[PDB]
Amino acid sequence: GSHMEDFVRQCFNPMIVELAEKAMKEYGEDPKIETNKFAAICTHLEVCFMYSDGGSKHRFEIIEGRDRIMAWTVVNSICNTTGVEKPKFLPDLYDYKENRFIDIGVTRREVHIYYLEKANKIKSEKTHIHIFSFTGEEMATKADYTLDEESRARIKTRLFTIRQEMASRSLWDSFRQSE
């Protein structure tokens, strides 16, 4: 019964918490034990949702937060109708405006490092990458940040708020060192 599990539950909204614990279940991890990862997935989820709200009405298709079969199902439907490369790994969103998949990263480390690590792993030329940090830095593929500045700023604000809430509860160091 960790302080972190209770913090997560009153910091993120119940829909986010539900989706996160389900995602961990499907991959056989326990939110009760792997608490830092629990917080990370909720954070990643909330960022993806704020991101998808950033655009026009139906600009983004949300792939993160689905179960794996349905997520892949939507990917092939997008691919088989837009003639776009089928990625090796599940992206987080699809941008109908820019006709590309997006994987969103959230890191406690330096954004350059995390970006470099992600590009190698995804091993998809076409997948756009957009990294946010808890300190307010962002790095996006080809310097193309997709959204306007204000949508990205509220994401960065929320991320820094989470960091303060954690640190005020002494969970930040453990969370920072866990990545």
Question: Does 104 participate in binding Mn ion (rule CB under 5 A)?
Answer: yes
| Sequence-separated (6 or more) residues with CB below 8 Å from residue 83 | none
- How far apart CA 158 and CA 155 sit, in angstroms, is 5
What gap in Å lies between CA 1 and CA 156, rounded to an integer?
Answer: 30
Which of 21, 37, 46, 92 does the annotation list as catalytic? Answer: 92
Comparing CA positions, the residue from 74, 19, 5 lying closest to residue 49 is 19
Closest residue to ligand KU4, based on beta-carbon distance:
27
Residue 150 is among the residues annotated as catalytic for this protein:
no
Closer Cβ to ligand KU4, 28 or 83, answer by number? 28
Residue of 29, 53, 61, 118 marked catalytic: 118
DSSP-assigned letters across all residues of 95-158: ETTTTEEEEEEEESS-HHHHHHHHHHHH--SS-EEEEEETTS-EEEGGG--SS-HHHHHHHHHH
Report the interface residues with ligand KU4, using CB under 6 A. 23-24, 27, 29, 37, 40-41, 44, 64, 90, 92, 103-105
By CB under 5 A, is residue 92 in contact with Mn ion?
Answer: yes
- Least distance from ligand KU4 to the Cβ atom of residue 136, Å: 18
Task: Map tokens 């892949």 to a residue.
Answer: 72
Position 122 contacts Mn ion (CB under 5 A): no
Indicate which of Mn ion, ligand KU4, none lies near residue 159 (CB less than 5 to 8 Å, by partner kind): none
Quick one: how far is CA 31 from the chain centroid?
A: 17
Which of residues 6 and 117 has its CB atom nearest to ligand KU4 in the complex? 117
Q: Looking at 21, 37, 46, 64, which residue is catalytic? A: 64
Residue 41, φ and ψ in degrees, nearest 5 = -70, -40
Q: Is 30 a catalytic site residue?
A: no
Residues that bind Mn ion (CB under 5 A): 64, 92, 103-104
**What is the set of active-site residues?**
64, 92, 118
